[PDB]
Amino acid sequence: ATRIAILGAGPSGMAQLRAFQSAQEKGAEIPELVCFEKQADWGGQWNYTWRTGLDENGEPVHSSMYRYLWSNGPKECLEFADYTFDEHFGKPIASYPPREVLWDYIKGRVEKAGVRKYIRFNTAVRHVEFNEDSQTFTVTVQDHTTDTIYSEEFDYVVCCTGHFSTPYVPEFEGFEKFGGRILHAHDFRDALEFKDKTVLLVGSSSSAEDIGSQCYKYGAKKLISCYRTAPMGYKWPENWDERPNLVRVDTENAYFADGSSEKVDAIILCTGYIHHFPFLNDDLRLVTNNRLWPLNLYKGVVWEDNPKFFYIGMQDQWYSFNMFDAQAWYARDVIMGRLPLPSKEEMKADSMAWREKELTLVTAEEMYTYQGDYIQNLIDMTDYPSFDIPATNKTFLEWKHHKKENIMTFRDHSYRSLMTGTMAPKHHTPWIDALDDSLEAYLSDK
Amino acid sequence: ATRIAILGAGPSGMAQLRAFQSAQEKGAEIPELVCFEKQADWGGQWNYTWRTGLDENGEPVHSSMYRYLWSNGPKECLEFADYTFDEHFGKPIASYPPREVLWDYIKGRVEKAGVRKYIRFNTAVRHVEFNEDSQTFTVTVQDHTTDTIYSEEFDYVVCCTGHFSTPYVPEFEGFEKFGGRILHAHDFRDALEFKDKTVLLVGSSSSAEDIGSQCYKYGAKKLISCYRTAPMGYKWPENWDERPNLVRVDTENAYFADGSSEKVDAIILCTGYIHHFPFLNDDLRLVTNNRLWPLNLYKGVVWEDNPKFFYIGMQDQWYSFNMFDAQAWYARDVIMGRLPLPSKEEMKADSMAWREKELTLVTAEEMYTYQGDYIQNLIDMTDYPSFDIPATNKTFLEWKHHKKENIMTFRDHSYRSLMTGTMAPKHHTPWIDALDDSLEAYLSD
Ligand SMILES: Cc1cc2nc3c(=O)[nH]c(=O)nc-3n(C[C@H](O)[C@H](O)[C@H](O)COP(=O)(O)OP(=O)(O)OC[C@H]3O[C@@H](n4cnc5c(N)ncnc54)[C@H](O)[C@@H]3O)c2cc1C
Numbered sequence: 089a090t091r092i093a094i095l096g097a098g099p100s101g102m103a104q105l106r107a108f109q110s111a112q113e114k115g116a117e118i119p120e121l122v123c124f125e126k127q128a129d130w131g132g133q134w135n136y137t138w139r140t141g142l143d144e145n146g147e148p149v150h151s152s153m154y155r156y157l158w159s160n161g162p163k164e165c166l167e168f169a170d171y172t173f174d175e176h177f178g179k180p181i182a183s184y185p186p187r188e189v190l191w192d193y194i195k196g197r198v199e200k201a202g203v204r205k206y207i208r209f210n211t212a213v214r215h216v217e218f219n220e221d222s223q224t225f226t227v228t229v230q231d232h233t234t235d236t237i238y239s240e241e242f243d244y245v246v247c248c249t250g251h252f253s254t255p256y257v258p259e260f261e262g263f264e265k266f267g268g269r270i271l272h273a274h275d276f277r278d279a280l281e282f283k284d285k286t287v288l289l290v291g292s293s294s295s296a297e298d299i300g301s302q303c304y305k306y307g308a309k310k311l312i313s314c315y316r317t318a319p320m321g322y323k324w325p326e327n328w329d330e331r332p333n334l335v336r337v338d339t340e341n342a343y344f345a346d347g348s349s350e351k352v353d354a355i356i357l358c359t360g361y362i363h364h365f366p367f368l369n370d371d372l373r374l375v376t377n378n379r380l381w382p383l384n385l386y387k388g389v390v391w392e393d394n395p396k397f398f399y400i401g402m403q404d405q406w407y408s409f410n411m412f413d414a415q416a417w418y419a420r421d422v423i424m425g426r427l428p429l430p431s432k433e434e435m436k437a438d439s440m441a442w443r444e445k446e447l448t449l450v451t452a453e454e455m456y457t458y459q460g461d462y463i464q465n466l467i468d469m470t471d472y473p474s475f476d477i478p479a480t481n482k483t484f485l486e487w488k489h490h491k492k493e494n495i496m497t498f499r500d501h502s503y504r505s506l507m508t509g510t511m512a513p514k515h516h517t518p519w520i521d522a523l524d525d526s527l528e529a530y531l532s533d534k
Numbered sequence: 535a536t537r538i539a540i541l542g543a544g545p546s547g548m549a550q551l552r553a554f555q556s557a558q559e560k561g562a563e564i565p566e567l568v569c570f571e572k573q574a575d576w577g578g579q580w581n582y583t584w585r586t587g588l589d590e591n592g593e594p595v596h597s598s599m600y601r602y603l604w605s606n607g608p609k610e611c612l613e614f615a616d617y618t619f620d621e622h623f624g625k626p627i628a629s630y631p632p633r634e635v636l637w638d639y640i641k642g643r644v645e646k647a648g649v650r651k652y653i654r655f656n657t658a659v660r661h662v663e664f665n666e667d668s669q670t671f672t673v674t675v676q677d678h679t680t681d682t683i684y685s686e687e688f689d690y691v692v693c694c695t696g697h698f699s700t701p702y703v704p705e706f707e708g709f710e711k712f713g714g715r716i717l718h719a720h721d722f723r724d725a726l727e728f729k730d731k732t733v734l735l736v737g738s739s740s741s742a743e744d745i746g747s748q749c750y751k752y753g754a755k756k757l758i759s760c761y762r763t764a765p766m767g768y769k770w771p772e773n774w775d776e777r778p779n780l781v782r783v784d785t786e787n788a789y790f791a792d793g794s795s796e797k798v799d800a801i802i803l804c805t806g807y808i809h810h811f812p813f814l815n816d817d818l819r820l821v822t823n824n825r826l827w828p829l830n831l832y833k834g835v836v837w838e839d840n841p842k843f844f845y846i847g848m849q850d851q852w853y854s855f856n857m858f859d860a861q862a863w864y865a866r867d868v869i870m871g872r873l874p875l876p877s878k879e880e881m882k883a884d885s886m887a888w889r890e891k892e893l894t895l896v897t898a899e900e901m902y903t904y905q906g907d908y909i910q911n912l913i914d915m916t917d918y919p920s921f922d923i924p925a926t927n928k929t930f931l932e933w934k935h936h937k938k939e940n941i942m943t944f945r946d947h948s949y950r951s952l953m954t955g956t957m958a959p960k961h962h963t964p965w966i967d968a969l970d971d972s973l974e975a976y977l978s979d
Pocket residue numbers: 095096097098099100101124125126127130131132133134150152153158159160161166211212213214248249250251252253295367400401405407408409
């Protein structure tokens with residue numbers, strides 16, 4: 089024999105391969121593995137590129153990640169269950185490591201497992217089609233090294249292409265006339281471009297705060313945040329304004345709902361992403377807004393309309409890397425026959441339950457607990473090692489309390505590994521002054 | 535019973551529709567037409583949007599066009615033989631009109647034609663595939679208005695998706711560490727953004743020349759061109775430099791081959807585009823660098839491996855809009871069976887002859903005169919109205935002399951139309967001071 093196509097080699101696609109290898113390393117017969125990645129290296133979001141818009145082959149630039157990015161939450165909340173920070177580094181480090189430091193930690197585990205062989209890099213997925221007679225999928229790809237398009241036959245397909253890469257970009261009145269830059273969070277790369285400039289941040293996602301925060305750090309003159317969705321109510325610095333939603337812009341001025349206006353040099357639209365799958369027709373294609381429980385996914389992973397097709401990591405992400413492992417392990421066992429699937433209507437009833445519960449959620453605390461609960465459910469069914477989920481939630485809660493205390497100093501705080509119990513030290517340099525992005529400057533004493 | 539798929543509603547797609555409508559107006563029965571267009575409106579490149587990268591539906595932003603873009607060549611060189619400037623504006627207008635004015639003009643023709651009803655907008659072509667058993671093409675699209683993906687069958691397909699939209703974006707050493715803006719020409723929109731800024735223009739194409747001019751016109755402090763090809767031999771302003779090829783950048787500075795160094799605010803890569811067709815497999819896919827004569831295109835339009843698949847406007851462009859018409863009218867008459875196709879073996883040899891001629895071309899005048907000759911060959915076969923192609927060539931030569939004279943005032947020149955003989959009036963404002971982009975400003979006094 090059986091062949092499995094794996095779509096993308098970010099954390100999810102890496103988790104999937106790692107799952108099969110781990111089973112194989114325990115003495116199990118695994119199917120043939122082929123993983124298509126469109127970039128030249130693995131990492132998905134984590135593989136930083138200066139590029140924006142379209143890449144060197146004309147494929148949409150995937151990564152939304154920017155210079156000076158640090159761990160969004162505590163590292164202790166993403167720590168792998170089968171690979172620790174103590175293992176990888178040998179020395180206890182601070183709670184929010186920068187992009188390069190985390191990437192290296194993600195690379196350590198995946199290189200150790202030796203799954204790089206299975207990946208065909210620089211190869212973009214064009215189309216995935218199911219053949220009712222064959223009961224197998226056809227996968228058409230464009231290899232950019234030889235500039236040829238070829239297709240192979242597989243028994244199962246696992247889609248790990250993400251859903252934070254194809255921006256939702258709304259239009260406001262008069263954008264046509266605006267004299268400054270307009271970009272989505274997805275295009276944002278470098279805070280230095282906005283040095284001594286006034287930036288308007290539109291929308292209220294997690295990135296809105298952090299992109300805004302990076303701009304403040306690197307010498308922005310003014311930041312203005314506006315959104316219609318419920319105000320977050322933080323402790324913003326002296327030069328950071330919070331306004332009601334945007335109605336209009338003109339050549340150099342932004343207009344808001346209260347009737348007020350201001351001069352702005354650049355507009356950043358932190359307005360989210362869409363679930364986009366150009367390689368799939370409607371029979372296989374997941375359509376959903378970003379949320380904790382999308383429909384048509386049995387156990388959050390199995391495409392109900394075709395059980396031999398799988399999605400990894402398509403849920404909104406409070407948890408990340410631990411969720412993808414739990415999912416990949418489950419999917420793995422489903423492919424292998426270790427876990428039988430229920431009837432279609434039974435899968436749907438199960439899904440309906442998960443949704444009915446998702447609709448009840450109001451607080452931040454209910455939401456991670458719910459995702460915690462989901463991951464727990466997946467882990468109970470496989471040989472994947474369990475981990476302290478309630479304590480991981482508690483750490484999440486503590487991190488959200490620090491954000492509300494002070495939005496500029498939350499990255500200086502420290503947390504305890506739930507893998508080892510070792511308390512992370514305080515970093516040598518406070519966040520606001522730690523201008524050097526690098527791993528080398530992170531792993532040392534200056 | 536015969537059904538045609540037209541991919542794209544830029545000038546080419548507009549031309550293709552118009553060519554069929556023109557046959558119908560004459561009395562002929564025409565096949566069923568369906569046009570797919572991923573944008574919300576027609577005009578292709580000429581449809582301006584503030585957006586860059588990906589569009590509202592997450593499709594790649596197609597238009598490479600920027601604010602304050604005016605016609606690159608004489609409008610007389612791009613006039614429709616069947617729909618003149620005199621007929622559309624009802625009056626004489628200058629020779630180098632702003633994008634909006636030209637866009638209003640190309641929409642004019644198709645509005646009059648009434649061909650809008652064949653187009654399905656906000657629809658992106660996903661895949662085109664030919665069926666051996668059926669001898670038909672299966673065309674799969676994504677309708678972004680309905681969020682549905684569907685397919686329909688067509689007997690012929692005409693690809694008009696363009697080839698100046700998917701960027702060739704080379705990387706340079708230090709790009710990852712450079713503290714300023716790096717964009718491709720494809721993303722350039724507003725030259726005001728670069729006011730009082732030092733801008734590096736990398737590469738040598740026709741937009742390099744213009745993009746730099748817009749940045750100069752709108753108040754850049756300094757501009758640097760760097761390229762690998764032969765000297766352009768243009769007289770640039772005092773704040774405009776020429777350097778050899780870029781080698782590396784650091785955080786603030788750019789470095790060149792000769793050992794020179796310069797502080798730059800923004801790097802705009804005017805490095806070109808690739809023929810990119812994600813919706814086709816290798817059986818149908820056109821593979822080629824940007825040139826006047828690509829292979830596997832009989833009469834430059836008929837795809838030699840599958841004669842029922844056509845390509846419009848896929849050559850490099852000296853002539854533009856009336857070349858598309860000529861291709862479109864030819865491709866129309868082939869579809870309707872007015873023009874029979876020779877052996878696959880005989881098609882190859884005709885294409886290799888045009889190709890061997892292509893390789894002997896050195897001068898600019900040899901390059902457009904080649905293309906003039908190619909159009910002449912096309913229009914001789916169809917009822918597309920004859921027009922003075924040698925006199926068009928002479929207008930290109932004039933334009934070229936005007937560029938060589940002063941690169942910053944060539945747009946102030948005037949030309950006789952080769953359709954109506956109308957002498958284009960000198961514009962109310964010289965280009966360098968004509969800061970207002972709009973049609974309304976361009977048409978007033
Ligand atoms: C701005 C930002 C900041 C973030 N910060 C954090 C953080 O601090 N901590 C945390 O835990 N998580 C963070 N995340 C969440 C992030 O989604 C996960 O960390 C993780 O990257 C998700 O992995 P994934 O494999 O599911 O998708 P992705 O990381 O997006 O990777 C998907 C992969 O699929 C590939 N692909 C897509 N389309 C194709 C195609 N057609 N053909 C071939 N390959 C394709 C891509 O190249 C990519 O490698 C952040 C996300 C964003 C957008």
